[PDB]
Amino acid sequence: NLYFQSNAMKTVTVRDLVVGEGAPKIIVSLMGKTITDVKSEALAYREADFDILEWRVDHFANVTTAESVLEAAGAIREIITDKPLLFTFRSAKEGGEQALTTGQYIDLNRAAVDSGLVDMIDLELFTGDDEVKATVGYAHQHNVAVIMSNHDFHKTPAAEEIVQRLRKMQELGADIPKIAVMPQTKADVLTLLTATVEMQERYADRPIITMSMSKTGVISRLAGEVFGSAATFGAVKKASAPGQISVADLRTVLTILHQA
């Protein structure tokens, strides 16, 4: 599992994929309740064009059973063999389907890191600073990269607050700070982009991932190359968050912008 990190070039390289270089990378979210459902979805996703596979563990029914989680991850790794695998338990208040105690959520990520089956984990910043910092270090001890994340599905904080949150993620050791916000106005989309630019140019020594959700915020999913967001989420069969477009349409736009 070794991944690379170049602070000077602001890149994170996982499975030969250079996040932070060139056109933004496409992340898709795989959801399945049972082990066989995860296999089925992995076989379907193997036919799609994406760069990073995110397993949304909060959609899995047996999330507190260690052996079941490990079996599902192994199944994905056996089907999708050449793309980085990102392990994400999204909490209900951050956009997901389930909620765990802080301890259960650490056990779960701990076990994912230990297995060697996943290349990256997602850690929610709000989990708690001590908890998060320790877990980041642990992931790094095992050659697992961390996407640190924060999501607001109702509003867009001020740009200064968005920047500060991305700076803290970096301070806590996130390899890739990530923030998703919801616009209530057209200007809010621009606020998210402003924060992206400011963070990326003034403070980051690594890639960042940002997005303004809903149809109104779609542009933020497409303009990463210019504004400084290193990856973007697309939909394979169904959108996992408001505003995602199909992977095919997303790749089309990213390519056009890259070659403009």
Add this chain to the structure above:
Amino acid sequence: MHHHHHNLYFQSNAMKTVTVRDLVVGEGAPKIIVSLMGKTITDVKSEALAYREADFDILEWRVDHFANVTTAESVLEAAGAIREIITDKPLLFTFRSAKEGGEQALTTGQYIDLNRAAVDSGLVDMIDLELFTGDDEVKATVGYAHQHNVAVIMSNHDFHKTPAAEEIVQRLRKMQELGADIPKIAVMPQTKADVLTLLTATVEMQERYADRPIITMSMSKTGVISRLAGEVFGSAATFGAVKKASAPGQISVADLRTVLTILHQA
């Protein structure tokens, strides 16, 4: 002082649209404008015939590239040629002055007389008038175009910097005050933030002050996204390239229509 004894465009203030040759500017996905440049009447004809096959909505004739811009009748001969060739799309007459990057310079009197001649001809559906021409002549010429059912795109360009958002909004508002049917502004980013400043101005103008469509763009490769996001931010049209870009940042019409269509999906 212009008098009529005893072209057609529509505009809806409340819907914020301008309709010319059945094209509804301000509704749905942004419209694509392409620019035709030719030095002689022979070059204009060859380029119009060639462009006829392209996917665009509005044809802009860049009169400043024409060598014989000095005798109005000669300019009207080329306009007729384009009108005979492109019969079903709006034709925008644009002499882009030396002050704003035009390949040429003309005195204000010559510029006003050229645009009056274009209006008189009935061969063009719209004229471009530069905001910075001078208020008395702009107002008079806007009124003159309107008397003839010719729409006006009022324009302003900065190829070296992006003014503050407030200044961009003031210019768009002034265009509306002067009677422009479609205010239009193009600015050049020096930083990534400058691209966002142009979009901020677009949103504020469109939401708070406009009762008509506006056209805005941040030039260069850096500003390309501004040419693509008009549906959400409020820019009603966008310039594309048929064979070669006519301003920095334009992409091919095929790529532009592809992206616009994706963004319009719902």
